[PDB]
Design a protein around this ligand. Sequence first.
Ligand SMILES: [Cl-]
Ligand SMILES: [Cl-]
Ligand SMILES: [Mg+2]
Lengths: 317, 237, 261, 295, 223, 226, 268, 206
Amino acid sequence: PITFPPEVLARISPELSLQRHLSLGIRPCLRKYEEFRDVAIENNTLSRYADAGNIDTKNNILGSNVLKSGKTIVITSITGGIIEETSAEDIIANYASVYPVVEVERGRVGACTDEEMTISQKLHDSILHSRILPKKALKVKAGVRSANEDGTFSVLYPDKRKWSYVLYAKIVVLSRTGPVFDLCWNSLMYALQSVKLPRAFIDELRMTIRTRGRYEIICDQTKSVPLMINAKNIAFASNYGIVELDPECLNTVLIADLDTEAEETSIHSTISILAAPSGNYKQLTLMGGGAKITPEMIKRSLLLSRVRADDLSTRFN
Amino acid sequence: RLEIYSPEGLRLDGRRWNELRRFESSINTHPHAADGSSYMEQGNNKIITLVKGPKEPRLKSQMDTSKALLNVSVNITKFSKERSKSERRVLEIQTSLVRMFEKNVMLNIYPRTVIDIEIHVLEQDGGIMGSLINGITLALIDAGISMFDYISGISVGLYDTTPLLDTNSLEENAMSTVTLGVVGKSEKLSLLLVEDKIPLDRLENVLAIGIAGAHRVRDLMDEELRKHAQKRVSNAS
Amino acid sequence: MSLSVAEKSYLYDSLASTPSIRPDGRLPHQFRPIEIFTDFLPSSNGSSRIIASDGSECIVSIKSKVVDHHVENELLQVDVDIAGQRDDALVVETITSLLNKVLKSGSGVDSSKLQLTKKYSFKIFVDVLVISSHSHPISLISFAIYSALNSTYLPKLISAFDDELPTFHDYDMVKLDINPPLVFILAVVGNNMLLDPAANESEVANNGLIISWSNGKITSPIRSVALNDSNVKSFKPHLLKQGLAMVEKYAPDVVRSLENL
Amino acid sequence: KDIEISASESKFILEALRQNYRLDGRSFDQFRDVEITFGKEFGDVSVKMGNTKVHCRISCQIAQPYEDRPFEGLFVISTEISPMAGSQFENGNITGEDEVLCSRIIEKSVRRSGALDVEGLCIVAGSKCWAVRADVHFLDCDGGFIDASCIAVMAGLMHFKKPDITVHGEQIIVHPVNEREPVPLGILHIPICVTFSFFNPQDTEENIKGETNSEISIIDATLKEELLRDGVLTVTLNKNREVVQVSKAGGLPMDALTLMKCCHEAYSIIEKITDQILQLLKEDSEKRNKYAAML
Amino acid sequence: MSVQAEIGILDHVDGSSEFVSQDTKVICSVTGPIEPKARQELPTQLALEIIVRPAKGVATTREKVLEDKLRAVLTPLITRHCYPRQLCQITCQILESGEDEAEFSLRELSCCINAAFLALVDAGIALNSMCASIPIAIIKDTSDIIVDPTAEQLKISLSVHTLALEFVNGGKVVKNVLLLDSNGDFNEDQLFSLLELGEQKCQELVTNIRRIIQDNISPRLVV
Amino acid sequence: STFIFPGDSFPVDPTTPVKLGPGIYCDPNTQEIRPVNTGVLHVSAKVQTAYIDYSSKRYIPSVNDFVIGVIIGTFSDSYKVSLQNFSSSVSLSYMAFPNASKKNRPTLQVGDLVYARVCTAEKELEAEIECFDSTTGFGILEDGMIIDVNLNFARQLLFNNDFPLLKVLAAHTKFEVAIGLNGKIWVKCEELSNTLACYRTIMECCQKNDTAAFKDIAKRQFKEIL
Amino acid sequence: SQIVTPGELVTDDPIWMRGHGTYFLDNMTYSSVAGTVSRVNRLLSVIPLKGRYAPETGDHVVGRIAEVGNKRWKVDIGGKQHAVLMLGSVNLPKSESDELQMRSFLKEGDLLNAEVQSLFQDGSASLHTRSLKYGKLRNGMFCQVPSSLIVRAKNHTHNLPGNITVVLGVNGYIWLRKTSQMDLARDTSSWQIYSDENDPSISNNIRQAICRYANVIKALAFCEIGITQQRIVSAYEASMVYSNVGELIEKNVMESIGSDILTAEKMR
Amino acid sequence: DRRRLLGPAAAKPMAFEQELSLHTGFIENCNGSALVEARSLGHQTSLITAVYGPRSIRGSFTSQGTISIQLKNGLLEKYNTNELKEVSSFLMGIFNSVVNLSRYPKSGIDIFVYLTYDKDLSQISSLIPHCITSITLALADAGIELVDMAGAGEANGTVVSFIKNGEEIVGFWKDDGDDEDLLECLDRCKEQYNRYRDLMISCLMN
Ligand SMILES: [Cl-]
Ligand SMILES: [Cl-]
Ligand SMILES: [Mg+2]
């Protein structure tokens, strides 16, 4: 036989680096089989409504979240927009979503990678299907601005054209070591809870004929309302992997929260879950490329995802 | 006031139906920037044409062992029109010019080389496709690159029944136009471009006037070219 | 621009020598001859065309547009288009940002000179086109912009200054007498400064300087540009003071050379 | 990826043209038989020409008209190529030579010509209008992509029916198909593209300075014929004796009168095609009214 | 359920198929093994170029996700190590979505999986096993598990699922679950009732897929 | 001869020695012999040869196959040949000709049609063909027309002598045919009208897959040529 | 001599040998370029008025190394194609070890002096430096004029007054250097012939004379005057009227230098 | 953009001394990283740098390295694209005279500067010195040879970067500002240079 140091075997064959670790009972990321990465969160840090008094007039971010789980750093910022409505239960048609732009910062520079694009769509689709954001929560309660007394303009909001808010998300990822969708989703969930929608108004003609030669909605620089998401439908992400133990390096193990090149490259049986605390599961992804996904792994992955969701929502009050 | 085509037969600039615009060409306008160069002044149009090559390609991958590579790049400057802040249409102009001079320039006799054509439109005013053709024909001849014959460009609009030779911007927006690329003095068409509706029966008359006007443009170009050559050999004598 | 290391080492020794021996016998403050043409684009309020001695050519077009200066913060806009260079390429973006700072409605240029009514002023669109370039063209562009803005003529106003839109005379036109700035580029070769650095001179220079000039005084922006990447080295502070004094001394000669209309 | 043609094949097909023979048994002036299939939905149309297969899908959504043209609806055409029509095509390069030219022909033949009545798409003059979209899917390529797309788009626009809408001032209520029946689109004319492929049986010197022109012209070339041609001409006509557009960009220089005889040649075909399209539409409509009586 | 399909309909690809489940309709082309690009080359095994085109408009990231999920099903189905340093072009053109594209895509995914499988069958590419995909939805107030749901049923569905299983031994053994894409609100007890009934209807589909494949390929060969 | 699908149970028992042909795969991990192609599984009698006849149009180079290629490039010691469009190129050595010497190189130019036999077809290497007999009709195919055909039709035309296509064609004209197992069939006659009539008949007969229709198709095609 | 343009008929006589810049259909022979008709023996040809330098066997050229390949260099000569410089065609200071470290002699961007040994079928030149007069250039500066101004002559490396030597490449690539001892041997040890180091004793007087010769060569080219050894020294002596070498860059000065040479040769 | 989710097109956007903290080696994909967080009485700024390299360029005869510096607006899109590339150009000019490029031939070094926080209790002038601080730290963590510790300071629009204890200048930048300020500006900028350089060296040791 011939053995190589750990530093080369990771490069020589990431498949063996995992199997050698699993034969010893450990994982390449030095965590236990069902151990997650520890997360630390900073909320509303990049928001223009961060300081309750001194509101940043230049900033346009409505909500933010900085997330660190292991070596990976994920930073999310929520921006806004208003569209004019031109149109006439728990069913999907009455629910909206947000539009993310994921930038996974690596040594390359250029166009959007398939990873960046798929995560962006996966985020948008799951916020919709989990019924987190209802369309009613984005309708603009618009006011009116009139010139009071003589000079100063006063804005009066109610306690006719119609508008609706549009939410955009930019998610940057630093120090990517493994699958990063779960970090992006969980980071976006914390950010969405800190979102504050600015108030809108209009002042008290294009088609009319004009002599030679001779309107839109405006946001409030201070006043803001909270984004009314259905908190019961907020879910949290966790990923799992099913590995078959090689006899030389029949039997399977379940791995929680995949990280490092060794795990990501070689594990082809994955389980992705979005689970709402106390509530039901919002998303389940089974991919049986590797070992046979038996009901026992499914039942165990569902069990670990519940305690992971309970941990993530509770840990940060 | 002005009219498009008055009852007396006068157009906006005062031309009759078979009158060209003021045509002025120049050769060897940028010797310290290209092998062959040409400055086109057809009416209000102002076009710089730069021919670089035949030369060694930059990437050995993009190189043909059997013939030269011909590339055309048309840059329409921001100040050519009444400024707009705003593509797929410029791409059509480029590949069309390439396909034209592919069959005219003897690319087979310049193998493993690359002929880059660099165009800058300084001022635009109708019939720019024909003026682009004239700029390339002169600039390639100035570069000493072998070609079978001249290619002359011309545009003709149809006002009711009367073809209006050499159209300007307002005439193009008023009536349908045909753009011709005529090989030398023949009736062979390198480029035929009917950009909008024309009655099938009135189209042959438009083509006839265009071919005739193009032949005049060819002689005007040839005249200017022989003048430059005769002035060059007389100065050196 | 490719050079053999035997070429570079011979050039650098000649330039950094005391006194500097430039490859054309030029003095450290002497400029290369240029040809200038003005008023050739009738569709524009002003035009200029400059041809450097090395073959570099640049065309500038000045165009106007009446705007409400209460909503138009910047009343002067430069668009640089360098031939054979992406519009998002670093050199284009850098020169565009730099030139916009050189003009900028309230710094180098006199904003009040563009005013028409109490509500409306002229916005000037300075469009730059570099047909050919062999070195950093910021100085060549600046000279061409300078010549264009001087030959610029604008329509004469009729309506009153106090405020409908303004009304202009059909025939008569007024000249634009704004004071346009000048951007000079310098080469730092050893302990010597060189005005108007040539291509080969810049290939061996240790550092470079971009110095602006307006109304007879040194103005901003001022940058330390790297004219290459192989032989870039730090320079002593006295060299920075020496280059600035060089511009303040010989730029008036450049102005009266350009101003000869 | 390139399509390699053997020297024996290039000689045989060209020598067969000199003997007035086409591999698929057609004559030089014979346009392929156009087969038009309609789906269940309005705007689903599938065109077949021998082996060439295209599919078009007409769709519309409510949008706002441009401020410059406030009385006008919107209309756009999409013709992105995919490797399904053959491995010779790269996935969605909308900048390739043939891709750019062919796209501009369909745009000039259907969009620029105003075959669709963009005034009828306007709902209310200031905002709210219809934004129609014509998406073309090249399924199988045996040549004649331009001619097949032009027929597919027009057959789709005519077969398509937009949903009926009722406006209450600023309120635009888009009625579903189950509430009120949809209204068809307004077609001002039916343009048809006929593409001529030229073959030079001699040298380039006999084409620039030759007395007797010997260039061979065939209508609607197959893939093998298209790959061997020395020139191409796409002419567009309608039954109103209008030349909608002509495109002969570069290639083998052609005698002007020869190109003119091509335009008159194509008018005989575009009459057969226009009447054929209208007939298959009438037959399709009669089928739906027969099932409306059974329902 | 009841599905209709064809095989070998395109002339300029190595394999082709058309698959219709209710109103969803996908045509699929397969070309391989062919010379790969330099960027795509894999030394040990076969590389896959999977493309999905929408029924309307241009391709968006929505189809990029369908391409990713389709790769997850097809990759373990192809015996990739038989074609080292080669390429396979699986191209899916969705013709009629059969669902409100704004909210749902599971019918298109399930149809692309079957169409891609059939086109790989028509192309003669080495396959380890068989495959069938079904879309499933759980309807709002009735809480019933509707296999192969209609476009109207999906509008009032509280959860939507795509199930694609790997079949061996005459389509009676379930080798693995190639993809289970569940979206919406559901619990553990609902999920396993879904997987049970889903495997039953999946087993009905391979049996129907085996029948359609045999009816198309048997007349092509000699006995 | 039974119909088999991929992943089905393989009928043959391991106790019998078997030589594996196309369609059957031996798992490197599980060592189980299982099918990977869908078609008819043929098994011999007495040393038993088993294979699956499956439909395909993309050729894969295998040894002892007769193929028609086209020269697309000349290298230092070999020719770059293409047996099918978009497929990987094939190498044809200069020494792979009858009476080959280091003094006389072959006279083939780019674009010539070559009829050859596959000698080395390594899955991880560039395939190779030869123009000399392995046991001692190859060479350049001058002029003529090449026909695209599916691989099952090409194998049936070369090995099954009961295939009526070659008989009904000889009954109409005198023709020279070269059959390639990569889907390319080369035909050449004295007159162009006959070669085209053979192209059209082979094209239509390839589309029907019905052997009993070859005679009627040939009769109408040569009648249309007249 | 007749001036013709593309497409023009040059002769209807078919009993002619078709030369360059021509093409024909049956008896009619046309011109492919705008140039002058040349009738030599039986070879009718058109000499183009413009075009890059076309190399001929025996030309003394100055070139820049463009790329380093397999066992050859591609040199920028100023023509349509790169010229090749085979490893066997250079005097190395053969071993198979040197075939790998080719960049130890000539690297990309190096300037050299060579002779056109032959031409390929496409027209590109094969170079060789199998002599003492050919090799890498140093101890000076490069400058180029159009190839049409360099008249092919018996010799192309001339020693000028002031201890400066010029290399007038037929392709128009000129090299000015300090007159080396080897250059003095040209009237009727060196182990490192590819050294990238310059002779570290180049005085300022020698450096200033290189500039003056550079400017007068540029001035002669600016007037489109043919560059010869007799004209370079005549312009160099005439330019002494101007004290500073810098004055020679202005247009009026350059046109004066060229005019004073032409009018002086009219008297002579 | 087809490669993004930009929502509806009809939607329009919404219209309404210095304490330092340095860390290195916290990013796993790059060769060297650094974090600079600066809190002043009037502005707080945080930014992260990442240095990838040297990475060999395919078929590169370059005798030395090729530095690339991309200044990204990581989340906070406060600064215009024109000015970011101008600062990137300025930054590349500095470090092209500090990195011992001769030691890394045929290769290339790519530097990324992500802005992560910027609130002022244009402004791009005062941002440059903290990028220089971060790039020098990140290049040292990546094991790239530096001729000196490159640092800079800012004063009234003037930005000066020093080496060799302020004896020589590696970069100079001046926007707006007053006249004849040079002498006083070089003094105030050298003070920040020494302060940042001491903290930078103290960071790499401890
Ligand atoms: Cl245009
Ligand atoms: Cl050079
Ligand atoms: Mg990116």
